[PDB]
Amino acid sequence: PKPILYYDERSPPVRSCLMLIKLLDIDVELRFVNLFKGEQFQKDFLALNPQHSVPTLVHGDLVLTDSHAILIHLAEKFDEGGSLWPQEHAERMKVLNLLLFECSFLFRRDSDFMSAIVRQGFANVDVAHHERKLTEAYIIMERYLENSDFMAGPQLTLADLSIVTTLSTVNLMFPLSQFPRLRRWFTAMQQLDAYEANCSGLEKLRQTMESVGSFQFPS
Amino acid sequence: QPKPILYYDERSPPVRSCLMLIKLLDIDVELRFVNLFKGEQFQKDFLALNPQHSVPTLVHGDLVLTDSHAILIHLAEKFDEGGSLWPQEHAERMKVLNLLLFECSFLFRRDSDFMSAIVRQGFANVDVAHHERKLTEAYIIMERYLENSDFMAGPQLTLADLSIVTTLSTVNLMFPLSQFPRLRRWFTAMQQLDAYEANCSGLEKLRQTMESVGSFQFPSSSAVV
Ligand SMILES: CC1(C)CC(=O)CC(=O)C1
Ligand SMILES: CC1(C)CC(=O)CC(=O)C1
Structure with a gap:
């Protein structure tokens, strides 16, 4: 089935x-x-x-x-034979490692921040605290991309698909202005036909969060 | 190499x-x-x-x-090339992978939240009831998995059991397993493995460090031994 x-x-x-x-x-x-x-x-x-x-x-x-x-x-x-989940062991472990970073670090801090807005309203949220937490993820990710077109290497992988959606979500609030590699990578990700699947839900989330949190994101 | x-x-x-x-x-x-x-x-x-x-x-x-x-x-x-710890068959391997991610995102996260709170605040100043709810929920989920197979991801030992048992033994320093018969039976079985000896020293050192930096004593009756 x-x-x-x-x-x-x-x-x-x-x-x-x-x-x-x-x-x-x-x-x-x-x-x-x-x-x-x-x-x-x-x-x-x-x-x-x-x-x-x-x-x-x-x-x-x-x-x-x-x-x-x-x-x-x-x-x-x-996608047998594809590069999203590479056949070479070391390349695959790098992708796996980044998927786990997305789980334990980037998404966890995004969800902590956005869940705090929902439960308490944007006015009850320590934005500086979550800005520090999420800027630290930006910093790590900027360094990942040093001399690397994509998150795990020269080819698009599952790590990029996992990270780009959460990055676009954190980016509703915290700009990428200070992170040139992250900005370049995010812009390149946005040119993929498949990225269109991110657009509807990202906008729905923006609207829902601004309603339940009683605020506007910067933008 | x-x-x-x-x-x-x-x-x-x-x-x-x-x-x-x-x-x-x-x-x-x-x-x-x-x-x-x-x-x-x-x-x-x-x-x-x-x-x-x-x-x-x-x-x-x-x-x-x-x-x-x-x-x-x-x-x-x-x-362990070709072994059963990281299964060869796709569906069995995905079940292990799925539980490794449960350990990362749910069990270990809530354990680390609780233990970090003790270190930063001191045991007497921690909302223990809050973390008891958070970690009992993890017990419940693990009990559900074990109601449908002896080991976490299927009928035999896998990386999922290795990942989960260490964190389970850590949470269980504080929160007893009296109400979780499947999880007690599984934990006891893991404790019989010769490889479990590699968990014992660090668990005891953690107990010693937590009790000192947190200024408390774990409830002696909680730890399954
Ligand atoms: C709907 C959500 C709040 C779910 C999350 O956990 C985090 C997020 O970014 C959107
Ligand atoms: C040393 C520790 C506090 C590290 C953790 O993050 C959680 C734990 O159980 C032991």
Whole structure:
């Protein structure tokens, strides 16, 4: 059977999966789970995925509850021979390492910041604190890109798909003005046909956050 | 080929996960200590190697891995080539990968949040009830996984069990497993593995350090032993 993707396109990791699906022409059944209504806590979804996490992919009996597993699974199933998930071991480990940086560092700090706006309203958020946290991710990422067209090397990989969606999300608030490599890379990512899958959800997130947080992002 | 170099502090559970795999596979590695409580992960030379200032960090030739789950997979592919720890069949491997990411994003994150709070605030000043809820939720999720197979990712031992057991033993210093029969049975089974010996020393050192810097005593009845 085809994969089923439980999604809310406002979430960056969801958009990373949407980008890969568009890049690889994968036929997937989308099922919307409204994160801002807490539908990930519905009894049937909790039974499927007690982590109540989105995206979730059901492919046959396989239930993937993390976007980085979904990206790797879809690349191995639908992009054999591709560069997104390289065949060479060292290159693949570099991509894997960056996917985990996105999980544990970039996305974690983005989600901490954006979740704080939702729960408390933008006025109750220590913006300077989250600016420091997320600028540190910018700094690390700028150094990753030294003499490297893409995040993990000279070729587009899953690391770029995973990072670009979250970067575009953090960038709603914190500009890339001071990071020339990051800006150049982000601009290049925006020229890929597959990046169009990021656009709708990013704008929906901007509108939702500005409403629930009672503010405007800078812009 | 150059021998792998592991930057480590055995008090960290993800470090102990790598130590367990290194012992299980008899991997010859060079160990370089980075004292997390002295702040040696912020030394200029280590920051230049890993700006995430985290252990474990592995250097193997020109490859620099800065996440324990990449280290586990890398070492499995180089030194357990064709083995079952990192399964050969695709779906089985994805299940392991999925649980490694649960450990990264959910279990270890909540463990580190709780332990970091103790270090920064002192135990008496930590919202323990808040973290008990956060970490009991991880117990619940792991119990759900174990209700459908003996090991975390299937019928046999995988990297997922190595990654999770170290952090589980750490959380369980504080929060008992009385209400989680599957997770107790699994934890007891992991404790019988010869490779589990690589978890014991760093877990005890962590208990000693936490109780001193946090100025408390873990509830002695919590730890499954
Ligand atoms: C809908 C969201 C709040 C989900 C997250 O966890 C972080 C983010 O950037 C968008
Ligand atoms: C030394 C530590 C505090 C490192 C962590 O991040 C979490 C943990 O359990 C032990």
